[PDB]
Design a protein around this ligand. Structure first.
Ligand SMILES: *[C@@H]1O[C@H](CO)[C@@H](O)[C@H](O)[C@H]1NC(C)=O
Ligand SMILES: *[C@@H]1O[C@H](CO)[C@@H](O)[C@H](O)[C@H]1NC(C)=O
Ligand SMILES: [Ca+2]
Length: 220
């Protein structure tokens, strides 16, 4: 009734996360403040492309700063050539806890808008990583851009996880202008912190809905 849903896919395990990119308008500071947009409606906009096997989850970009009202192009976002000054990105994969306990994921800051969803039927459905996004607004970290207020600082979300089970994770991040900043980390059950590089923890599987026992609703 209370344990977070996990999965156990049996397909060949791939390292890292899948990252899709989407059209986002320069200086649109309203669309990404809709919870429905950050949850799933981003997928109804123009998909630009995707990269796989991404293990470094943090977003760090700054333009030449001569104009804070023009787009700027770069591959700094996961090796994909786009406009970090204005873009929406969807990262998906499965987080694998090597120990049982509490996992506190964190955004040191959010610039402009971002989300973290953790669990089956929250981030996405088990064995269905690359299917269209589910409608859940049940964010583990809600960093949806707070309208007229300044960027938020050290916002956290905690998930209790059981060892050896794959937990679906989805981050949806958007930027409308200038800097792109989402420094992602997690404090593990033993207390140690993992910044940026999530290699060893995050994995992908090809979709396989024929596998009926993929969903584990109560890992305890
Ligand atoms: C960002 O803005 C520029 C300027 O309008 C536009 O040409 C470009 O397509 C935009 N990029 C994305 C990914 O939406
Ligand atoms: C779930 O079923 C798959 C075969 O479809 C199998 O590989 C896996 O070991 C099963 N898990 C359990 C706990 O029975
Ligand atoms: Ca910005």
């Amino acid at each position: 009734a209370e344990a977070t849903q996990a999965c156990l896919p049996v397909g060949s395990r791939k390292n890292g996360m899948n990252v899709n990119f989407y059209k986002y308008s320069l200086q649109d500071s309203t669309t990404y403040s809709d919870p429905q947009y950050m949850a799933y409606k981003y997928s109804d906009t123009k998909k630009l492309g995707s990269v796989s096997g991404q293990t470094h989850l943090s977003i760090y970009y700054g333009p030449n700063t001569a104009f804070w009202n023009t787009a700027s192009w770069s591959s700094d976002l996961f090796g994909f050539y786009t406009t970090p000054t204005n873009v929406t990105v969807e990262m998906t994969g499965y987080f694998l806890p090597p120990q049982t306990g509490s996992y506190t994921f964190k955004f040191a800051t959010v610039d402009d808008s971002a989300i973290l969803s953790v669990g089956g039927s929250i981030a996405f459905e088990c064995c269905a990583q690359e299917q269209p996004p589910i409608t859940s607004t049940d964010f583990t970290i809600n960093g949806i851009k707070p309208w007229d207020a300044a960027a938020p600082t050290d916002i956290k979300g905690s998930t209790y996880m059981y060892a050896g089970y794959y937990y679906p994770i989805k981050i949806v991040y958007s930027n409308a202008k200038a800097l792109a900043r989402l420094p992602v980390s997690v404090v593990l059950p033993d207390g140690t912190e993992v910044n940026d590089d999530f290699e060893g923890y995050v994995y992908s599987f090809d979709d396989d809905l024929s596998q009926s026992n993929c969903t584990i609703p109560d890992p305890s």
